[PDB]
Amino acid sequence: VIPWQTFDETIKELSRFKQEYSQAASVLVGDIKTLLMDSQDKYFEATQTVYEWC
Amino acid sequence: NNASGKLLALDSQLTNDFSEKSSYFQSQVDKIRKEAYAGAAAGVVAGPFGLIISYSIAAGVVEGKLIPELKNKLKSVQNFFTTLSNTVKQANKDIDAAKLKLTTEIVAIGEIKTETETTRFYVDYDDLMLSLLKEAAKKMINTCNEYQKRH
């Protein structure tokens, strides 16, 4: 008379969607952060080399 | 640079999973109340005595011991989340301060290497009494003494 198992299955499905996409997005944003810091290190090295030559 | 990305990838997962536990709490408290006030309705096998002595046990035990203990556990989870967020926020400041400390010293060493290379090229005129090489050496002496005063 009270459908509790379908309620639990719906809650677990709508939670599993969000868990999956948080786990998928966090690693990719953390990789973009590393790339953006390595680019700044290469930029600093190149501009400092040209400045020291000039 | 790798740890400075792993730290952000941990922080975002933390801030999402805290909310997905805070919703699980409210979805589970209602399940406890459903099971308690549904099992307590089987006190109709006795008279009116057997009904009140079941609803009194249910609405005493569940509403006085099981719900505030879960609220205290949720409060402990909140305090843990705040502490770990402050730890991540401090680690970012440490990494950024270390990187700035290294790049400032790279620039300060380049300011010496420029004058050293200039004096090395001024030597190649094969004229030791050239006033320009004398002025370059007098500039390098002041630069080296001002570097040694800093360390």
Q: Give the type of residue at B83.
A: T
Which of A1, A34, A53 should be substituted to probe chain B, the one whose Cβ sees the most B Cβ atoms within 10 Å?
A34
The structure tokens 């290294």 sit at B102
C-alpha torsion angle, residues B13, B15, B21, B24 (rounded to 10):
-100
Q: Give the type of residue at A52.
A: E
Interface contact A26-B9, CB threshold 8 A: yes
Minimum-distance CB partner of B113 among A18, A37, A52: A52
Length of chain B: 151
C-alpha torsion angle, residues B74, B80, B83, B86 (rounded to 10):
-80
Q: Give the type of residue at B67.
A: I
In units of Å, what resolution does this entry have? 3.2
